Amino acid sequence: TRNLIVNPLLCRKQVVVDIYHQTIVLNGFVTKYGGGKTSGFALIYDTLSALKKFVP
């Protein structure tokens, strides 16, 4: 969806979630005015050893 950034330095994959209506972290989600489309940004922290290490 949208764009992919492969980020092995942070052991991470990040996407721009485009909703057409533990390793998962979701942030910055807001809908469009008048319902329907909702957008957001997702955080693929794969192994559960980065999530803790690389997570506030």
Partner: protein, 158 residues
């Protein structure tokens, strides 16, 4: 200045507060387009005055000036896509001949009344404000929405 953001005005009050010639002329535009108050007329006059000033500035320059070619084409392109200026008139001199009626005839309220979705220009305002009319993919509740030519045939009910 104290704020790092930017704030700009959109309308100006007239110089002479009381004239009978101006009062009835504004009322003709209000009745023909169903405007809330004279602040909506003044925004159109301000918006028109800006483009008129731009065209007037470059008309005094030489025809082949690179400054005129860059700004003149950009001003005309913005006018064409907004639908205000018909595509045949591709000369800057036609911007000075524009009137406040041309801009007012491109508000979403006017189009949805002309397109027949509403019975009256006042019914168009109520229909727009009720989240009942969609332009392409996103619903709109602001009747001052100036529709482009590409979004002109994309108006339909909710």
């Amino acid at each position: 200045g104290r704020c790092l953001r930017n704030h700009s005005i959109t309308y100006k009050t007239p110089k002479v507060p009381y004239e009978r010639e101006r009062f009835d002329a504004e009322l003709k535009l209000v009745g023909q387009f169903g405007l809330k108050n004279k602040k909506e007329i003044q925004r159109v006059h301000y918006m028109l005055g800006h483009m008129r000033t731009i065209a007037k500035v470059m008309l005094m320059k030489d025809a082949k000036d690179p400054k005129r070619l860059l700004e003149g084409a950009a001003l005309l392109r913005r006018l064409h896509n907004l639908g205000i200026l018909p595509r045949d008139q591709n000369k800057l001199e036609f911007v000075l001949a524009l009137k406040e009626e041309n801009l007012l005839e491109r508000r979403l309220q006017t189009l949805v009344y002309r397109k027949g979705f509403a019975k009256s220009i006042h019914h168009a305002r109520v229909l727009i404000r009720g989240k009942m009319i969609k332009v392409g993919k996103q619903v709109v509740d602001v009747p001052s929405f100036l529709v482009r030519v590409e979004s002109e045939p994309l108006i339909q009910l909710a």
